[PDB]
Design a binder for this molecule. Structure first.
Ligand SMILES: CC(C)(COP(=O)(O)OP(=O)(O)OC[C@H]1O[C@@H](n2cnc3c(N)ncnc32)[C@H](O)[C@@H]1OP(=O)(O)O)[C@@H](O)C(=O)NCCC(=O)NCCSCC(=O)c1ccc(Cl)cc1
Ligand SMILES: CC(C)(COP(=O)(O)OP(=O)(O)OC[C@H]1O[C@@H](n2cnc3c(N)ncnc32)[C@H](O)[C@@H]1OP(=O)(O)O)[C@@H](O)C(=O)NCCC(=O)NCCSCC(=O)c1ccc(Cl)cc1
Ligand SMILES: Nc1ncnc2c1ncn2[C@@H]1O[C@H](COP(=O)(O)O)[C@@H](O)[C@H]1O
Ligand SMILES: Nc1ncnc2c1ncn2[C@@H]1O[C@H](COP(=O)(O)O)[C@@H](O)[C@H]1O
Ligand SMILES: [Mg+2]
Ligand SMILES: [Mg+2]
Lengths: 503, 503
């Protein structure tokens, strides 16, 4: 195999004096050799402090040059980074770190989260990111350290994704998965090796796209990763021009915002260096696809994928957002919903898209054998995406098998929000749905029934969500206060019908 | 890993009814699904006849759809194909088959070779290719067979390479090597996944370029492989036009011939479909490069590589034939000649190019661990090429460490020809050199001295070479008959003086 460490090590031997990390706002630039030196220094320090290979270490930080260094240093040592969304609140972060039996937690989020981890009794050593590396500069002691033995099936990285109930699942990415999780960017997207590559780091590092397909791929191809700490679409387009960005890979949400900024820049706008605009994370709305086609340059590529199996379908110069086909690495099937992996659907019958679990695939969810058995069956990964084969022989993605909402490319299950809002004073029933939204894809929407003879307020419900343990980004954008909810003859709420009722 | 069998199997699930193999002159076309069926049928038949996984099977045939089916059927069964140049004569072939402990030999080269194999006592079962499959149509019997378990380090394919002495060595290519031996065509050459790929099969299947980088790459990317049975430059260019070929990978020898044909044909040929013109196998002479740039369309890419480690250096749109830099997968060093793998020379000093032995690398020469130890040392493969780092930070390929001649992308050692000509009646002393030649790169040249007072003739010596055990393509293109070789008091040839005298 070629591990992340190996890809980046080899890249640094080929292009030592070429810029690896650019942070234009902070005036920081690091060559491949400089980055390597810093990764080594941070690895040596962690090792001197006692950290061992195969130990799990949480990483909870927004995108920055410092977190890039920390993640790669953990991997260099042989520790398994468990990347966590820094927008999550203290109790959720502490409980995930506890259940993960992690050895340390590198955080940039800082004091209340740190206390939560301590009080949880996990025993994870809390490390402030700024105490490890600051503005690219490590605090190091200790000799150079050995290379850990990495084995193909062995845990390498952990990424989290939402289940239909409970806390997010910890997807274990094996060492062997790294190469294909990078190289689809060559085979599908058409990136090629070279120092010409200038990649805009829009996507979060704590998800597989922002990590493997953006950061690792940029450096592994001997190019430059441009760090973006906060998404501002006007500033982003200015970076494209300023850094001469050649490729950008983002959500339909990002691209709706970018294409709008592009249009608003007027008839003089030129973004000549940009050769690739790639999208993933959610269904690309047709309206967004039109603005992207009309206002941004480069080849447009739709990339369908999952945390668990990475890229499974794609489309170059798509005419619609729903239609894609398997590329290199990939084998796919559409099977009867609820049926076995061999129960392939007829002609144009709808079913669940399932994808072969090969090199790119996760090896299970940490400490969740039941959740794993539901998703990994007879060599296949079950996407929970509804799909159909077209007369053209392509795959049309139609929606979810489950009730998962996808907003800003983030999976949010309605139960997360229903659990919280169900305890808000005055609420007698709550059902949460996703409404079609050009910007967000699906907009989190609460349908709430007040106690008889009482009223409810969208402002008060929103306040309650914000003070709750629920991540702020997940809270409802809109509330519908209703006297009743549509129900079947078994008193279950007709969720899909309700979507049509309030849309 | 992703084995050859998996790449091709997955391709066939994605593009079943797309053309995989085209032989336009025979009117033979086979879809990916049709090819897989013929591969399965041949594999089943071979298993019925007693062939088993990891048994070695020689393949001795020129390029054809039938040998493609046979090689892939052997692999599908789990046998190890050992690909041999069909231009080698019967004694060399039989002895290589014997030395390899081959179970069987699939031959399209006739009864004399069959008899030599039989009489050698090797016990290798002789199989006529045309008795297995002919014009794409298999003779099918036997029940379905299992797809055997394949392991990363397990022998997958054997390819032959010449040493400084003795018979060619059998380089064992492991299962794990297939993927990077294909994917460098994406990262370096810029081929991408898709049915748009129409690849012209110029390169011999019995070397690693023609097999991995041409045949397997074409099919694995869901494209079409256009079979070429016999190279004729005008006919090849007509295939580019007729089949709308998008990529062609060949030697500088091929390209010299093609560029001349294209120059002559001018506007009567429409070559604009051709998007990639790639070269490897020998130093690209600057005069060939110039005419290639002038007369052939598409992006020009020089690929440096070896049987043992595949691609190690490249250059897009090269200005010279000798300067290249490492691409994806590759890590290189230049070390003191005769020194250890850690004895890196100072930039600007000449030394041996060595390349990291990673996933792509062979695992050793069959039954020759001494020869293996000379070439595979502490995780590095030693190329026997002399090289230097340029002030521009690139690698400049110079000569050989070992006197190897490279003619038409074929390695030939002078000793092979010298040992044969030393027995020709009338010959007393012989030195064989390779003279610079635009078409062949190096032209095999024999400097010969007659017995006292006798005469030699180029015609008689040529006749002797042709009737000898030496492969015909290796025989001298030119003879210099001399009264005496220039030699010192030690009776040793003043090589520089000789080359000067005949150049
Ligand atoms: C679009 C982003 C940047 C948010 O926009 P922005 O930066 O303007 O937000 P902000 O931080 O300034 O706050 C502005 C207000 O918006 C709210 N917000 C934030 N995120 C979301 C969201 N996801 N949904 C709904 N609301 C959101 C946020 O709460 C704030 O309002 P406030 O709290 O009232 O201040 C953010 O949602 C994002 O980075 N999304 C990308 C997530 C991602 O990386 N997804 C892919 C993960 S792997 C998945 C996958 O499917 C896949 C696909 C292909 C392959 Cl090959 C492999 C895997
Ligand atoms: C250029 C070829 C096609 C020969 O041309 P052509 O087809 O016109 O010859 P032909 O069979 O019609 O007979 C015409 C007369 O030329 C004579 N000939 C044949 N081959 C050669 C040769 N290599 N050197 C000198 N003379 C040659 C042949 O004997 C015939 O005269 P005759 O015997 O009088 O009929 C042939 O030499 C060839 O196919 N060469 C390609 C060799 C090759 O595949 N090399 C790469 C192997 S792997 C090596 C490697 O370096 C690498 C590189 C990159 C990577 Cl990534 C991995 C590995
Ligand atoms: N290009 C795309 N088109 C449609 N849906 C997508 C695309 N990329 C990702 N998704 C959705 O996002 C889910 C993956 O998110 P996660 O479960 O966090 O890995 C997939 O199962 C799809 O529902
Ligand atoms: N692009 C190239 N430029 C110069 N020499 C090459 C190139 N490709 C292959 N070679 C030569 O061919 C040899 C590989 O042949 P082999 O190891 O027998 O497959 C190398 O050691 C080089 O001498
Ligand atoms: Mg913002
Ligand atoms: Mg011929």
């Amino acid at each position: 195999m070629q591990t992340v460490n190996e890809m980046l090590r080899r890249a640094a031997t080929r292009a030592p004096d070429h810029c690896a990390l650019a942070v234009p706002a902070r005036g920081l630039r690091l060559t491949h050799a400089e980055l390597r030196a810093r990764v080594e220094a941070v690895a040596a320090r962690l090792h001197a402090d006692g950290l061992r290979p195969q130990q799990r270490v949480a990483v909870v930080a927004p995108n920055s040059a410092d977190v890039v260094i920390a993640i790669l240093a953990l991997h260099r040592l042989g520790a398994v980074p468990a990347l966590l969304n820094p927008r999550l609140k203290s109790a959720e972060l502490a409980e995930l770190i506890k259940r993960g039996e992690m050895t340390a937690a590198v955080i940039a989020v800082g004091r209340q989260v740190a206390d939560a981890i301590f009080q949880s009794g996990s025993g994870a050593r809390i490390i402030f990111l700024g105490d490890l590396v600051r503005d690219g500069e490590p605090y190091s002691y200790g000799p150079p350290i050995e290379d850990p033995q990495r084995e193909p099936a062995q845990p390498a990285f952990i990424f989290y994704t939402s289940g239909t109930t409970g806390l997010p699942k910890a997807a274990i990415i094996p060492q062997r998965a790294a190469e294909s999780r990078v190289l689809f960017m060559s085979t599908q997207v058409g990136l090629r090796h070279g120092r010409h590559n200038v990649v805009l780091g829009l996507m979060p590092l704590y998800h597989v796209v922002g990590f493997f397909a953006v950061l690792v791929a940029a450096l592994a191809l001997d190019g430059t990763y441009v760090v973006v700490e906060e998404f501002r679409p006007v500033d982003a387009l200015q970076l494209v021009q300023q850094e001469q960005v050649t490729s950008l890979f983002a959500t339909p949400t990002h691209l709706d915002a970018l294409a709008a900024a592009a249009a608003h820049a007027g008839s003089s706008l030129k973004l000549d260096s940009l050769r690739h605009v790639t999208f993933a994370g959610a269904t690309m709305p047709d309206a967004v696809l039109e603005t992207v086609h009309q206002h941004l340059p480069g080849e447009k590529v739709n990339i369908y994928g999952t945390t668990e199996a990475m890229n499974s379908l794609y489309m170059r110069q798509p005419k619609t957002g729903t239609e894609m086909a398997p590329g290199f690495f990939s084998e796919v099937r559409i099977v009867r919903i609820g049926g076995g992996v061999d129960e392939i659907v007829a002609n144009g019958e709808e079913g669940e898209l399932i994808v072969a679990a090969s090199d790119s695939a996760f090896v299970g969810y940490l400490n969740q054998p039941q959740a794993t058995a539901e998703k990994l069956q007879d060599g296949w990964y079950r996407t929970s995406d509804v799909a159909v084969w077209t007369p053209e022989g392509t795959v049309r993605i139609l929606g979810r098998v489950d009730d998962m909402i996808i907003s800003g490319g983030e999976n949010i299950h309605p139960s997360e929000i229903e659990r919280v809002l169900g305890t808000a004073p005055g609420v007698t029933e709550v059902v949460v749905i996703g409404l079609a939204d050009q910007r967000w894809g699906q907009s989190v929407t609460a349908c709430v029934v007040p106690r008889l003879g009482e009223t409810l307020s969208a402002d008060a419900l929103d306040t309650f969500c914000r003070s709750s343990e629920l991540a702020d980004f997940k809270r409802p954008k809109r509330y519908f206060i209703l006297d009743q909810l549509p129900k079947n003859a078994l008193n279950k709420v007709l969720r899909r019908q309700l979507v049509q009722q309030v849309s």
